């Protein structure tokens, strides 16, 4: 039998979530969401079973001062996992160190805040001094600001970096709590904003999308699965299955 593939992933609504049950769940049965459905589809097409393992450090992945990576990216580089099936953003810096599939979903960074302010854009947000802002530590939004040569974004990075202890949150859930409970705006991917703002009517997107990019399945460089995965993703795309999966996990339809 084909060796069981090790899948690195991360908890993120509605991509990967704990299933609610009144009875014990083990292994993969503990999880549900868009990425679990994607895995079910991909594994059918490619002919494997798999073992879902949450990334031990709970990070997506970024490189430090010394050039060392962490998170799911590190798991792939170190061949601790065969695949990363998660909302893993396809970026230039990452693509140099792992092999991504073609994208299964598109998105862009935008702003999540409460309602009622005159802040209408990143420019507004960077200029004002009332509201703090940041991003998930060691994810692609953080790295976007870190690498930016756009003046407003350079300022925003200097600010986030200066206030890193507080401004850079552990995960999206903690960032949402910080938005709700303090004067803080979260720089968050638009698909995640879409999800949360249709469920919590106290939240809103501010401004438009600041960039445009995709989520892809990650594999270690040289993986024999990456191209097979790309082909499977395109099949699912063309068959309308990716669209259906998005409708299943995002619907409805929740706030004015
Ligand atoms: N999808 C991002 C994590 C979320 C974010 O950075 O806003 C990543 O792959 O690193």
From Swiss-Prot:
Q: Which domain of life is it from?
A: Eukaryota
Q: Which GO terms describe its biological process?
A: central nervous system development; chemical synaptic transmission; glutamate receptor signaling pathway; modulation of chemical synaptic transmission; nervous system development; regulation of synaptic transmission, glutamatergic; synaptic transmission, glutamatergic
Q: Does the keyword Transmembrane apply?
A: yes
GO CC terms in record: intracellular membrane-bounded organelle; kainate selective glutamate receptor complex; plasma membrane; postsynaptic density membrane; presynaptic membrane
- Keyword Flavoprotein on entry: no
Please list the residues that bind L-glutamate: 87, 89, 94, 140-141, 189
Q: Where in the cell is it found?
A: Cell membrane; Postsynaptic cell membrane
The cysteines joined by S-S bonds are 201-255
Residue ranges, Extracellular side: 118-256
Question: Sites of glycosylation?
Answer: 2, 202
Q: Which UniProt keywords apply?
A: Cell membrane, Disulfide bond, Glycoprotein, Ion channel, Ion transport, Ligand-gated ion channel, Membrane, Phosphoprotein, Postsynaptic cell membrane, Receptor, Signal, Synapse, Transmembrane, Transmembrane helix, Transport
**Family that this chain belongs to:** Belongs to the glutamate-gated ion channel (TC 1.A.10.1) family. GRIK1 subfamily.
An additional note in the Swiss-Prot or TrEMBL entry is:
The postsynaptic actions of Glu are mediated by a variety of receptors that are named according to their selective agonists. This receptor binds domoate > kainate > L-glutamate = quisqualate > CNQX = DNQX > AMPA > dihydrokainate > NMDA.
> How would you summarize the oligomeric state and partners of this protein?
Homotetramer or heterotetramer of pore-forming glutamate receptor subunits. Tetramers may be formed by the dimerization of dimers. Can form functional heteromeric receptors with GRIK5. Can form functional heteromeric receptors with GRIK4. Interacts with KLHL17.
Q: What is this protein's function per UniProt?
A: Ionotropic glutamate receptor that functions as a cation-permeable ligand-gated ion channel, gated by L-glutamate and the glutamatergic agonist kainic acid. L-glutamate acts as an excitatory neurotransmitter at many synapses in the central nervous system. Binding of the excitatory neurotransmitter L-glutamate induces a conformation change, leading to the opening of the cation channel, and thereby converts the chemical signal to an electrical impulse. The receptor then desensitizes rapidly and enters a transient inactive state, characterized by the presence of bound agonist.
Question: In its UniProt entry, what is this protein called?
Answer: Glutamate receptor ionotropic, kainate 1
Question: Which organism's genome codes for this protein?
Answer: Homo sapiens (Human)
Q: What is the lineage of its organism?
A: Eukaryota, Metazoa, Chordata, Craniata, Vertebrata
Which residues of the complete protein appear here? 445 to 820 of 918
């Amino acid at each position: 039998a084909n060796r069981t593939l090790i899948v690195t992933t991360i908890l993120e609504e509605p991509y990967v979530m704990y299933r609610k049950s009144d009875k014990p769940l083990y292994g993969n049965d503990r999880f549900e969401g868009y990425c679990l459905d994607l895995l079910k589809e991909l594994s059918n097409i490619l002919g494997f079973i798999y073992d879902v393992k949450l990334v031990p450090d709970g990070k997506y992945g970024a490189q430090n001062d010394k050039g060392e990576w962490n998170g799911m990216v590190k798991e792939l580089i170190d061949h601790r996992a065969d695949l990363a099936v998660a909302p893993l953003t396809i970026t230039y810096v990452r693509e140099k160190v792992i092999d991504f599939s073609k994208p299964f979903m598109t998105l862009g960074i935008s702003i999540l805040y409460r309602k009622g302010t005159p802040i209408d854009s990143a420019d507004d947000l960077a200029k004002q001094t009332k509201i703090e802002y940041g991003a998930v530590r060691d994810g692609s939004t953080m790295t976007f600001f870190k690498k930016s040569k756009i003046s407003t974004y350079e300022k925003m990075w200097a600010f986030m970096s200066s206030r890193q202890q507080t401004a850079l949150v552990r995960n999206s859930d903690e960032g949402i709590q910080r938005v709700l409970t303090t004067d803080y705006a979260l720089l968050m991917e638009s698909t995640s904003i879409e999800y949360v703002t249709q469920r919590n009517c106290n939240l809103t997107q501010i401004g438009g999308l600041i960039d445009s990019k995709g989520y892809g399945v990650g594999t270690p460089i040289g993986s024999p699965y990456r191209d097979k995965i790309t082909i499977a993703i395109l099949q699912l795309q063309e068959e309308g299955k990716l669209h259906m999966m998005k409708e299943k996990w995002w619907r409805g339809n929740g706030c004015p």
